[PDB]
Amino acid sequence: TKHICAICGDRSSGKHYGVYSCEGCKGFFKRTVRKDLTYTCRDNKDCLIDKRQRNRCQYCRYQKCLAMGMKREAVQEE
Amino acid sequence: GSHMFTKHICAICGDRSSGKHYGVYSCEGCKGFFKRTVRKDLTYTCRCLIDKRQRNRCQYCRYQKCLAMGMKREAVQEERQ
DNA sequence: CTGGGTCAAAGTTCATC
DNA sequence: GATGAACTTTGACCCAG
Ligand SMILES: [Zn+2]
Ligand SMILES: [Zn+2]
């Protein structure tokens, strides 16, 4: 591989919903959109996302997905 | 490989295994024990045979067996909110 | 290449000592 | 405070097209 995840910095093989992303962030974004998940996420504090801490705050992760350009409309409701 | 509805045994204590945890076929007991040990960096005075009935009698030996059977500290992840 | 699905193995909770 | 049965989410890998 040569691409990296725009969300968390993990290895990325391709683009998912408009953005270079890892299998993790692809799966996470899919589930969030499909289930209409809203995250309260205790203390968001610094919404820093990296491979080791991506699962710490779901709110911070989702917000980063949108900030980097992931498209809700690109998630097929199958 | 491992499958959730298939009968397996714990490599540490011989109890019924709920699949592989941290690289080794283990029970929910040895999984939770290893997880807590690594997450808290727990120190065990204890320093013994590890089996279903006597696995809680010596925590030092339970932990040393987890490592000896191939449980990986790096497989334990960071806590989630 | 992109999408989606699967399900093992990561996660957490808490009743009961 | 520890344990571990039961519950929830993640993501590596497969594959349709
Ligand atoms: Zn990612
Ligand atoms: Zn065990």
Cα B69 to Cα A51, B38, B58, distances in angstroms: 28, 16, 17
Q: Which residues pair with B9 in a beta bridge?
A: B16
B39 three-state secondary structure: helix
Phi, psi for B59 (deg, rounded to 5): -65, -40
Q: Taking the alpha carbons of B73, B38, B67, B19 in that order, is the dihedral positive or negative? A: negative
CB of B6 lies under 7 Å from some atom of strand C: no
Instruction: Please give the CATH topology (third level) of the domain spanning B1-81.
Output: Erythroid Transcription Factor GATA-1; Chain A (3.30.50)
Residue A16 is encoded by which pair of tokens? 């998912």
Domain range list for chain A: 1-78
For this PDB entry, the determination method is X-ray
Assign B61 to helix, strand or coil.
Answer: helix
Measured to protein CB atoms, the chain D nucleotides within 7 Å are 2-6, 9-13
Contacts of B75 in chain A (CB under 8 A): none
Joined together, the tokens standing for residue A60 give 């911070």
Q: Which tokens is A68 given?
A: 């980097």
Is residue A73 classed as helix, strand or coil in its secondary structure?
A: helix
Cα separation, B79 vs B34, whole angstroms: 14
Beta strand residue intervals within A1-78, DSSP E: 3-4, 11-12, 14-16, 19-21
Element (H or E) spanning B16, and its range?
strand B16-17
A22/A2 Cα distance (integer angstroms): 12
Question: How far apart, in whole angstroms, are the C-alpha atoms of residue B49 and residue B77?
Answer: 28
The single residue listed with the structure tokens 């334990």 is: B76
- The closest of B34, B59, B64 to B46, measured between CA atoms, is B59
Spatial separation of the C-alpha atoms in residues A63 and A72, rounded to whole Å: 12
- Could you tell me how far CA A39 lies from the centroid of its own chain? 13
Residue A49 (CA) to nucleotide C12 (C1'), in angstroms, measures 21
Q: Using the CB atom, is residue B19 less than 7 Å from strand C?
A: yes
Q: Contact A56/B79, CB-based, under 8 Å? A: yes
DSSP state letter for A27: H
Q: What architecture does CATH give domain A1-78?
A: 2-Layer Sandwich (3.30)
Q: Token pair of A25, please? A: 């962030």
Nearest in space to A32 (alpha carbons), one of A51, A17, A47: A17
